Design a protein around this ligand. Structure first.
Ligand SMILES: CCCCCCCCCCCCCCCCCC(=O)OC[C@H](COP(=O)([O-])OCC(O)COP(=O)([O-])OC[C@@H](COC(=O)CCCCCCCCCCCCCCCCC)OC(=O)CCCCCCCCCCCCCCCCC)OC(=O)CCCCCCCCCCCCCCCCC
Ligand SMILES: CCCCCCCCCCCCCCCCCC(=O)OC[C@H](COP(=O)([O-])OCC(O)COP(=O)([O-])OC[C@@H](COC(=O)CCCCCCCCCCCCCCCCC)OC(=O)CCCCCCCCCCCCCCCCC)OC(=O)CCCCCCCCCCCCCCCCC
Ligand code: 07D
Ligand SMILES: CCc1c(C)c2cc3nc(cc4[nH]c(c(CCC(=O)OC/C=C(\C)CC/C=C(\C)CC/C=C(\C)CCC=C(C)C)c4C)c4c5nc(cc1[nH]2)C(C)=C5C(=O)[C@@H]4C(=O)OC)C(C)=C3C(C)=O
Ligand SMILES: CCCCCC/C=C\CCCCCCCCCC(=O)O[C@H](COC(=O)CCCCCCCCCCCCCCC)COP(=O)(O)OC[C@@H](O)CO
Ligand SMILES: CCCCCCCCCCCCCCCC(=O)OC[C@H](COP(=O)(O)OCCN)OC(=O)CCCCCCCCCCCCCCC
Ligand SMILES: COC(C)(C)C\C=C/C(C)=C/C=C/C(C)=C/C=C/C(C)=C/C=C\C=C(C)\C=C\C=C(C)\C=C\C=C(C)\C=C\CC(C)(C)OC
Ligand SMILES: CCCCCCCCCCCCO[C@@H]1O[C@H](CO)[C@@H](O[C@H]2O[C@H](CO)[C@@H](O)[C@H](O)[C@H]2O)[C@H](O)[C@H]1O
Ligand SMILES: CCCCCCCCCCCCO[C@@H]1O[C@H](CO)[C@@H](O[C@H]2O[C@H](CO)[C@@H](O)[C@H](O)[C@H]2O)[C@H](O)[C@H]1O
Ligand SMILES: CCCCCCCCCCCCO[C@@H]1O[C@H](CO)[C@@H](O[C@H]2O[C@H](CO)[C@@H](O)[C@H](O)[C@H]2O)[C@H](O)[C@H]1O
Ligand SMILES: CCCCCCCCCCCCO[C@@H]1O[C@H](CO)[C@@H](O[C@H]2O[C@H](CO)[C@@H](O)[C@H](O)[C@H]2O)[C@H](O)[C@H]1O
Ligand SMILES: [Fe+3]
Lengths: 47, 45, 256, 275, 304, 47, 47, 44, 47, 47, 47, 47, 47, 47, 45
């Protein structure tokens, strides 16, 4: 599977994947903050 | 890219992806222990 | 209440102040890009590197960005290549804000609106590595489109009506399909040939006859138009010189 | 204090009025007679605006307002306390704008370039004059001009827009909005194309006019040209301003009713007036 | 006295274009010439590039347009006459509040959602097309990001703010007069949208874009007798046209740009016009219920 | 029949076919989702 | 069916496939979240 | 080239199958959690 | 009266005549459809 | 102080100073006209 | 993992990292300020 | 202190200082005019 | 740690750091001024 | 700290300090003027 | 600038700045006599 880096440059692949992962993490975190159960800052009761 | 450096990048990229997935899996297991995110038939509680 | 952050401060205000900070940074960036030509500033009289500038000087001038050409050439911006302090003119007053009296014929001395940038002696290139500004004789494929007056053989006159010369050839840009120059043979000197920019012409297709008129310079001024070397391919400096000379007409077309 | 190429065009002449009296520079600025006059009008107008702020109750920059006289004064000059200050600031602003444009004309003559820039500024001056002079004169009172205030001239815009109950339905307003939006889109495209041609990436030698034409030939299907784009952009902006002026002359001086139900004419053309 | 406002004499040659890799699709359009376009600009028309992303975008966009038009024609019971009468007043209305972000019935906003999804997909695919076309010609992607700003405003209006409100009910309809009425009612529901400060910023940047593209157009037309229209060549090799363009604004204004940096200003004013607008749209309803009360609280209004 | 590819480039034919089929299938799924009967996620009763 | 890569280019095909798969995954996840039965973040009661 | 297409397909199919296997396992788990084909009386 | 055909070539003359006459026919038919008396489709009574 | 004319040309500084003085005088007159005690045209009573 | 700087310029990467961390920290601080529990300026009660 | 003129031209220093002082004086005068206590034109009682 | 100045012009670093620190200090001061408790100019009571 | 003038030209530092401290003095004075307590022009009561 | 005029210019500048400062100080003294601008802990009674 090492040959995929033949097709794609390590540096552009690294920066693109880094931005993608950070944006996805931010999006998931904001979704969780939007939900009542999983907002760890408001801390709504499970009940 | 050169195959010689491609092998090295693939090796340590594989190690780094293993590290990231492991840390994320630990985080997910901690969150699941705190509050599971798969509801039961009657909701959550 | 719903949107507040601390009592009086709310989310919209915070995002507004974030925008203000970003816009200050963007203005700094844009001013840095602006200061890529003609910088740093010189003294108005002596020409030493001096200007009333504060702590932003370190951030005022950017590092020279590098432009690559499709010939192996390179431009540096900013390149700190400045003009000579001593020009062919003298200060009306020695107060650093006074204008300049030309000390000769400013048409041919390149002073004021006649002044031309000190470019490089290479013609503009096309996608095929050939000159872009060429006469229509050496571009058989290019032709003047119909429904338009063909500006070949039409008398070239000034505003006073005197027939300065006769047009023989058109010079055109290959990169952008449009006429750039008219080649004009002098009625006073057959052995002399000049180039008159197409932007300086009126079509004048609606009159008793068809003629080309110029409102900038007079007929006699056609005897001192700057010349070119190759007569079939013109460098950037030569074309800039000719355009500057023609554009200098409006200011002082009747002596100085 | 001069650019690397500045101490070559700093010749005298090119001034309409003043001879050699004001033909000089102060710092980077060229002064001329009309620079002196624009200082005269700007200082006086700004001082009068600050004076009206002092007479006002706020000093809050966004709540500072200079109001025109009440419509009960008609086209008469008003007392300075109540309406007249707005009128003097209006006249000073008109004088300063005209001086600015004329100084631009002198600079254009001095540099031997076309007078396109002052001509284009003339349209902004005309829009302002139509808003504070032409339309109030046609409507018959100076109180139909807008107040000189940061947020209060927006209150004027909103009040006059809802005076015709929906000002979007003004067809000249629709056309002016279309031209303004198209000007912004065309400016984005032009700046983007020039920057992309000049900055094509790592390696990536600077591209020529043929590459710029090819980009929009491939993406859109037509390319205006590196000269024609500035033409169409200037015409777009000037036409947006012209149609805004038209839509404001049409509202009040000509049309004094609901713009939304102006369009019933369209509803009742004879080939679908089902009745 | 010539002005370079219209091209009196035109030139027509063999059509040609910059070289691209052949790819799956060739250039299409059998280029021709037009006279009025050559009077105002260039005369050649086409050819248009139609790649895989181009086909995808065109298919999605055509599906959205056909859905919208079919719904508009069906709303007037398929009457061409009455379609002509009400065309401006016709609109594909978004689904009501009760349906949330899920699929509404086709008559109750399902068609609006499907059309909006297809239009969003076609717009994003067109963005990808601009990016790929710029990259193929060995150029920069400034146009793609300038377009991305406009797409941000579009998605904020149509999708992102519905996401934040959890509701498509307050999205903008697919109609000529209906979308203006949406604009009016959106401003009224949230208190004098003039008092939105990001609306003020967006208006400032729209006015500034018009101002800038009149200033720059008039400057280039004023130095077009000096080779000033050939901007990229004056960027790589500074001619006297660029020098006089800079000195005019330096003498009349105190400062000046470069032939290269003026287009950076042009890019950023246009981009910010829609960036601030998208931010202001995302802020209303979610954070600020009433922009007039926000302005009163923050000193924009005299506090009635 | 066998010469249908002598008039159409197989790459262009495949790309156009895939694009059209994908968009059509997406549209059909969206339409069924917009129904009281075929929305398999809302799961409304037949009766 | 190994000749599918003799028509198109591996690198562009791979980036297109990854982008399409990610966008489809996002769309399906968002649709599931918009439904009451399958929203795993909100409290979802079957009855 | 077309010679490299053989190895590219050899690894591409393995990636297809592993991705599909993970997706199918996910679908099976979700179906256990909540099946998505309702019955005649809707969901219950 | 035949002298028309050396100023107006029959190609453009006849295509213009066709477009004009077709547009006029559409106009008259639509205008009739807008009137109650002559709308042959709705068929409102004469009285 | 007689040396100030070495720093500023009289022929133009004089005219600029005249313009500034006129602006200041006209501004002060406008301010007085804006008042209630010093408006000599309204002539409002001090008592 | 020291070869990452053979791909990324240490100056550019360090500047970008510093700016990204500053914006992330600023956003997290403002998010905590927005919440009732973790706003340390008003200091609302836990109960 | 006199070395300050080896940093700054005297002519431009004089013109800039005059402009700044005049603008400041205008500002302070206007601020006092807007003040109830210090408006010498409106002249309200300080008691 | 003394090597960072080989990456950055000390003038650039110093001026940028002074700018960032002053802007941050202004930001914090204004945020405190917005609070009821830490506003030292109106000085609302702790109680 | 006598060495900082090797980095900062005295003209630049002096002009920057003049402008920055003038702006800061204006800002602080205007903040004081907008306060109920330290506005020395209306002189509102302390108690 | 030529240092041969800095001696004269600084002395003129110092004389004029002291004159301006003294005139301003006398004006401020007169205004304070008419109406002081520093309230006591009751206001402007
Ligand atoms: C808000 C919502 C969004 C809206 C969008 C728009 C927002 C507004 C911002 C964007 C639009 C404006 C953008 C321009 C901002 C920057 C302008 C600028 O840098 O101009 C510098 C320009 C001088 O250019 P420079 O090259 O920086 O010269 C400084 C030299 O070091 C030394 O120069 P010198 O020694 O030659 O100067 C001598 C000069 C004194 O010069 C000055 O007064 C300017 C001092 C600052 C420079 O002499 C006198 O005038 C007396 O001077 C001005 O600012 C003119 C005024 C323009 C603003 C009014
Ligand atoms: C100080 C405190 C305040 C900060 C003020 C910063 C002022 C902005 C500086 C600036 O405008 O630089 C323009 C500068 C112009 O580049 P250039 O000299 O035309 O490129 C020449 C290359 O040969 C050719 O370059 P290329 O065309 O290959 O470069 C493409 C490049 C971007 O290059 C461009 O196409 C032109 C610039 C697009 C906007 C980039 C600036 C975004 C705002 C500043 C960050 O693509 C990107 O990196 C993505 C940028 C846009 C992402 C927007 C996503 C949403 C972000 C906001 C939510 O572009 C960038 O600096 C890119 C920044 C990438 C990181 C963005 C992080 C977000
Ligand atoms: C009673 C109404 C009320 C009133 C008070 C008032 C007045 C004024 N306003 Mg405003 N406005 C109000 C409401 C309001 N206002 C705006 C917006 C603005 C911005 C738009 C910038 C732009 O380019 O948009 C336009 C750009 C867009 C929408 C984004 C890009 C669009 C794209 C890529 C579409 C691609 C399309 C296709 C491929 C074609 C096929 C599709 C189909 C057939 C369906 C601009 C600055 C602007 C100007 C002024 C002025 C000058 C005035 C004056 C003189 O009074 N207004 C938007 C916005 O950004 O708000 C923050 C917005 O959403 C919104 C609202 C609700
Ligand atoms: C800075 C902010 C600025 C603001 C002020 C601003 C506003 C508005 N910008 C607006 C519209 C568009 N903007 C664009 C494009 C996208 C095309 C698209 O999505 O096609 C994708 C859609 C579709 C495919 C759907 C339909 C299709 C039709 C009608 C054809 C159907 C028939 C077919 C296919 C069959 C026949 C034909 C065959 C060949 C078989 C359109 C024309 C683009 C850009 N804006 C930028 C910026 C700005 N846009 C930049 C930088 C751009 C680009 O790069 C890009 C472009 O191509 O520009 C040339 C509107 C309506 C605006 C308003 C005022 O509301
Ligand atoms: C010019 C065109 C401007 C268009 C957008 C104007 C937006 C201003 C709306 C607004 O008013 O935003 C407010 C001020 O922002 C501010 O000044 C921030 C500072 C404003 C700087 C303006 C720079 C222009 C260049 C929010 O801040 P506050 O803490 O409440 O301030 C309160 C006091 O200022 C007034 O009591
Ligand atoms: C592409 C096609 C899919 C687009 C949608 C993607 C998912 C959006 C969130 C779904 C959701 O769960 O959003 C639902 C909630 C509202 O839920 P509610 O409380 O109204 O619930 C009522 C019952 N459902 O949004 C939020 O509050 C959070 C908003 C987070 C930010 C929204 C903007 C995201 C823009 C897209 C970014 C994509 C980046 C991807 C990484 C590169
Ligand atoms: C070719 O056409 C022929 C037949 C001649 C005629 C056909 C059609 C005609 C005449 C069409 C006319 C159309 C008109 C008049 C259109 C007017 C359009 C206007 C002015 C639109 C303006 C604004 C609308 C906007 C900005 C809408 C944006 C909506 C968005 C971005 C919505 C996105 C929604 C999504 C992604 C939904 C997600 C939810 C679900 C779960 C359903 O997604 C799968
Ligand atoms: C590698 C990092 C990322 C990891 C991402 C993978 C996360 C996977 C999460 C889901 C895995 C399955 O998790 C399993 O789901 C089933 C439903 O089918 C849950 O179901 C069980 O617990 C719930 C709790 O209320 C009961 O109501 C239910 O009756 C019972 O069947 C299990 O508690 C859980 O163990
Ligand atoms: C799923 C919900 C609806 C959203 C639509 C999702 C599918 C459509 C977007 C998929 C992503 C497209 O992403 C893009 O795909 C196309 C192939 O299709 C590829 O691009 C391809 O076509 C271009 C067209 O110019 C050609 O140069 C060449 O044939 C190839 O590069 C790009 O390398 C990839 O960046
Ligand atoms: C790559 C991923 C591929 C995914 C492929 C998915 C295939 C779907 C398989 C469907 C199997 C059908 O399985 C059968 O369906 C019927 C409806 O017809 C459902 O019927 C059952 O459930 C419904 C709803 O929960 C209730 O009314 C009741 O419990 C019962 O009728 C059940 O789910 C099952 O008895
Ligand atoms: C260019 C010239 C600039 C000149 C600037 C001058 C700055 C200093 C001026 C004010 C100096 C302080 O002036 C002093 O203030 C105190 C307040 O503490 C006041 O104190 C006096 O009046 C107050 C009431 O008004 C009484 O409560 C107090 O008992 C009494 O002593 C007086 O007003 C004055 O004695
Ligand atoms: Fe341009």
């Amino acid at each position: 599977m090492w040959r995929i880096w033949q097709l794609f440059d390590p540096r552009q692949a690294l920066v693109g994947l880094a931005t993608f992962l950070f944006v996805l993490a931010l999006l998931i975190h904001f979704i969780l903050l939007s939900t009542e159960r999983f907002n760890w800052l408001e801390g709504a009761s499970t009940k | 890219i050169t195959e010689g450096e491609a092998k090295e990048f693939h090796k340590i990229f594989t190690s780094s992806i293993l590290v990231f997935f492991g840390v994320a899996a630990f985080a997910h297991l901690l969150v699941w222990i705190w509050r599971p995110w798969v509801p039961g038939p009657n909701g959550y509680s | 209440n719903k949107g507040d952050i601390t009592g009086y401060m709310d989310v919209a205000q915070v995002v507004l102040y974030a925008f203000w900070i970003f816009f200050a940074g963007l203005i700094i960036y844009l001013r840095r890009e602006d200061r890529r030509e003609g910088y740093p500033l010189e003294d108005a009289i002596s020409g030493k590197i001096n200007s009333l500038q504060g702590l932003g000087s370190v951030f005022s001038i950017a590092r020279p960005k590098i432009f690559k050409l499709k010939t192996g050439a390179t431009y540096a911006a900013p390149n700190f290549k400045r003009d000579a302090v001593a020009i062919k003119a003298t200060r009306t007053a020695p107060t650093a804000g006074a204008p300049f009296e030309p000390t000769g014929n400013p048409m041919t001395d390149a002073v004021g609106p006649a002044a031309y940038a000190l470019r490089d002696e290479l013609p503009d290139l096309t996608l095929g590595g050939q000159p872009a500004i060429v006469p229509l004789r050496v571009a058989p494929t290019f032709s003047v489109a119909a429904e338009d007056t063909d500006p070949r053989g039409l008398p070239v006159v000034d505003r006073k009506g005197a027939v300065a010369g006769k047009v023989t050839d058109l010079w055109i840009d290959r990169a952008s399909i449009a006429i750039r120059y008219l080649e004009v043979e002098l009625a006073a000197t057959p052995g002399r040939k000049v180039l008159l920019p197409f932007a300086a012409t009126r079509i004048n297709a609606k009159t008793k006859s068809k003629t080309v008129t110029v409102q900038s310079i007079l007929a006699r001024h056609f005897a001192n138009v700057p010349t070119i070397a190759k007569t079939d391919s013109i460098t950037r400096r030569e074309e800039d010189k000719v355009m500057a000379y023609y554009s200098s007409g409006y200011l002082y077309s009747d002596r100085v | 204090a001069l650019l690397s190429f500045e101490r070559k065009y700093r010749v005298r002449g090119g001034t309409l009025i003043g001879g050699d009296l004001f033909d000089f520079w102060v710092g980077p600025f060229y002064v001329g007679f009309f620079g002196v006059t624009t200082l005269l009008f700007t200082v006086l107008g700004t001082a009068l605006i600050v004076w009206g702020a002092a007479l006002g109750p706020s000093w809050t920059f966004w709540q500072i307002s200079i109001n025109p006289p009440d419509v009960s004064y008609g086209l008469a000059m008003a007392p300075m306390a109540k309406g007249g200050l707005w009128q003097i600031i209006t006249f000073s602003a008109i004088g300063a704008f005209v001086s600015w444009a004329l100084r631009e004309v002198e600079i254009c003559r001095k540099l031997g370039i076309g007078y396109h820039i002052p001509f284009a500024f003339g349209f902004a001056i005309l829009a302002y004059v139509s808003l504070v002079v032409i339309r109030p004169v046609m409507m018959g009172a100076w109180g139909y001009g807008f107040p000189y205030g940061f947020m209060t001239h927006l209150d004027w815009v909103s009040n006059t827009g809802y005076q015709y109950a929906n000002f979007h339905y003004n067809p000249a307003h629709m056309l002016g909005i279309t031209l303004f939006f198209t000007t912004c889109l065309a400016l984005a495209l032009h700046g983007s194309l020039i920057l992309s041609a000049a900055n094509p990436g790592k390696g990536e030698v600077v591209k020529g006019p043929e590459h710029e034409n090819t980009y929009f030939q491939d993406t859109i299907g037509y390319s205006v040209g590196t000269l024609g784009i500035h033409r169409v952009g200037l015409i777009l902006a000037l036409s947006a301003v012209v149609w805004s002026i038209i839509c404001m002359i049409l509202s009040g001086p000509i049309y004094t009713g609901s713009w939304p139900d102006w369009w019933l004419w369209w509803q009742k053309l004879p080939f679908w007036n089902h009745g | 006295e010539y002005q370079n406002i219209l091209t009196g004499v035109q030139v027509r040659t063999a059509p040609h274009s910059a070289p691209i890799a052949k790819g799956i699709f060739p250039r299409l359009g059998k280029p021709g010439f037009s006279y009025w376009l050559g009077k105002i600009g260039d005369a050649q028309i086409g050819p248009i590039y139609l790649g895989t992303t181009g086909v995808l975008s065109l298919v999605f966009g055509f599906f959205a347009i056909e859905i919208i038009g079919f719904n508009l024609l069906a709303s007037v019971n398929w009457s061409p006459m009455e379609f002509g009468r009400q065309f401006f007043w016709l609109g594909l209305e978004p689904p009501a509040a009760e349906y949330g972000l899920g699929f509404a019935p086709l008559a109750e906003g399902g068609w609006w959602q499907i059309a909006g999804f297809f239009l969003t997909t076609s717009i994003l695919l067109w963005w990808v097309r601009m990016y790929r076309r710029a990259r193929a010609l060995k150029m920069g992607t400034h146009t793609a990001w300038a377009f991305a700003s406009a797409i941000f405003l579009f998605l904020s209006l149509g999708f992102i703010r519905p996401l934040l409100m959890g509701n498509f009910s307050e999205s903008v309809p697919f109609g000529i007069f209906p979308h203006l009425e949406w604009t009016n009612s959106f401003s009224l529901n949230y208190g004098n949208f003039f008092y939105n400060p990001f609306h003020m910023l967006s208006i400032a940047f729209l006015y500034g874009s018009a101002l800038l593209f009149a200033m720059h157009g008039a400057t280039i037309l004023a130095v077009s007798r000096l080779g000033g229209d050939r901007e990229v060549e004056q960027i790589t090799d500074r001619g006297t046209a660029a020098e006089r363009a800079a000195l005019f604004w330096r003498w009349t204004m105190g400062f000046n740009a470069t032939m290269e940096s003026i287009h950076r200003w042009a890019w950023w004013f246009a981009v910010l016009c829609t960036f601030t607008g998208a931010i202001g749209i995302l802020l209303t309803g979610t954070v600020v219920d009433n922009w007039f009360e926000w302005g009163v609280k923050h000193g924009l209004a005299p506090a009635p």
